Amino acid sequence: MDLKPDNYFSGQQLTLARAIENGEVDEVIKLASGTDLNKPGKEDMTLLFWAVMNSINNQKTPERLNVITMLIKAGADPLQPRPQGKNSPAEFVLMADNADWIKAMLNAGLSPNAVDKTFGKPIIFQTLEAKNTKTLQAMLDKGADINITDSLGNTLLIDALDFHSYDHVLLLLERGADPEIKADNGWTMGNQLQRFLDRAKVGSDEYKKLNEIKDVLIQHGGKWPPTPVK
């Protein structure tokens, strides 16, 4: 509900956590230079996750978003993993339905092609689980490689179609993502799209969206029908 900073921090980290709680940008800038920004408090809480938690709902204000920026500028690591394969603040806010929080991190100069420190996967892949394309748009607008690949050669376009993240697929195609890239297994996005199209029920909402993807693919110059997998 209403979080209390004393449940997670003590000492100088608590003094900074209270400045964050109060949304006091100048006090945050003053204190962040002398505080250990990355040592976690209790319950896996870090000072940067605390800043995210203090910038949501009625606290999603320009100053409280800028607190995130200023903590990263001071040395708080936006790619710090949590234990047990849990994700960093940058990956976490890429899952949001609004890009304000990732933009506050990009405003501190986080690379849009950054990879996560546990799995080595480009953090932009985490946008595919968001309920709309706003966080992917923010990453692409800041200059991310639209054709970046994971360790198995999958692109955002390939992974988004597999995820059934069809609005991400459409956005990637409209922004000029290369649909002809083959993953290590030799598949293109289009190879899967053809499988999906062939099994879809005529007139279902899935059928309608997959055909829209096919039309947009062609409209942006993609090869159709696809070359069969070798």
Add this chain to the structure above:
Amino acid sequence: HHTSTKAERWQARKDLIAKGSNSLYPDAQIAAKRLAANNIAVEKAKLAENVYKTVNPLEATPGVPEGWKDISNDAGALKKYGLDKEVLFDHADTPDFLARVYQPDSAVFGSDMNPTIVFRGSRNMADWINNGAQGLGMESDYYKRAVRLGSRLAKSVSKIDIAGDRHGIGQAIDCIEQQKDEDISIIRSRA
């Protein structure tokens, strides 16, 4: 409780199945058919049980059923199926979607079993993440990572099967084992 190795018991169970399938008696013949199917199904249900023992997904899961190896933390082995560790679980909180991948030992199972991916069933100061996820508009949808894995496995060149609450799985294993004991009795009755 068990005198022989898993491999020896697996072979001896197939030997008994073969004896039933060769019987003139129709009850022994159908008992052998069901026994063969349940012998396979109980191994899958034991893996389905095993995923509920995973705590840290980046660490070993204890009590992997004999004759199987957990490859969920072996990037090289997963690559064979087009998988990596990252896609096997959710990462914002304690995992809701979690899968584990197991390879059968051919020394035990020969070619009877395939690599198998098993999906686990979906499930105040420490709940700060769930607060954050709600204010951030997080979808929090178990199905997304499950469908994604289904889409990927359709491209796998190497054969891989899909399988997979904890109490219900245990009861299921009870019912399967009970059926096995009944079919073994029928078969032995016709010798």
